[PDB]
Design a protein around this ligand. Structure first.
Ligand code: HEC
Ligand code: HEC
Ligand code: HEC
Ligand code: DXC
Length: 71
């Protein structure tokens, strides 16, 4: 399957899966979540534990606005 781009208005956000499969061997951090996670995602999650917060906790991954968002 292909990577996905989140169409944030301030700039597309790429999500590269291969880098996540390799760096986050705890696949249940994202997979096998109960129902609601597709509908639940949005800006609050992305700037929180959905994206940025995990990077902050794992001490690796982009944490600045222009590292995630790129037109
Ligand atoms: C959240 C940060 C995730 C982590 C950690 C892992 N995966 Fe994942 N996976 C996630 C997304 C949003 C998607 C779909 C979008 C995409 O970019 O592909 C996937 C997809 C998969 C698939 C399909 C990949 C493909 O067919 O090319 C598989 C089999 C899957 N993911 C496996 C998987 C494994 C085993 C993980 C841990 C080592 C892993 N993922 C972590 C989000 C995230
Ligand atoms: C932990 C459970 C994570 C979640 C949820 C998300 N990401 Fe992540 N990301 C994680 C790690 C530990 C890393 C390091 C990968 C590396 O080897 O450098 C990253 C990295 C990225 C990258 C940069 C990838 C690269 O090859 O340099 C990007 C662009 C990225 N992550 C984006 C991203 C977004 C948009 C997320 C939510 C949709 C997301 N990450 C979730 C750990 C975790
Ligand atoms: C990657 C880990 C991110 C970092 C660092 C920042 N943002 Fe972000 N933001 C991210 C995602 C995945 C999303 C899309 C959410 C979704 O609904 O899919 C966003 C969203 C925003 C938005 C809202 C855009 C819209 O609703 O169309 C804005 C205005 C935004 N982000 C701004 C922003 C700024 C200024 C940041 C630095 C302070 C920043 N983001 C960091 C992913 C990431
Ligand atoms: C559930 C995990 C981890 C965050 C958390 O614990 O909530 C998060 C991390 C990244 C999230 C995905 C980002 C890309 C997609 C954003 C869409 O708008 C909703 C579906 C997708 C496929 C999201 C589904 C789910 O919300 C995920 C896989």
């Amino acid at each position: 399957a292909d990577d996905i781009v989140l169409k944030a208005k301030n700039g597309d956000v790429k999500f590269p899966h291969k880098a996540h499969q390799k760096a986050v061997p705890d696949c249940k951090k994202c997979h096998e979540k109960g129902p609601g996670k597709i509908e639940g995602f949005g800006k609050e999650m992305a700037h929180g534990k959905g994206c940025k917060g995990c990077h902050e906790e794992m001490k690796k991954g982009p944490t600045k606005c222009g590292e995630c968002h790129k037109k």
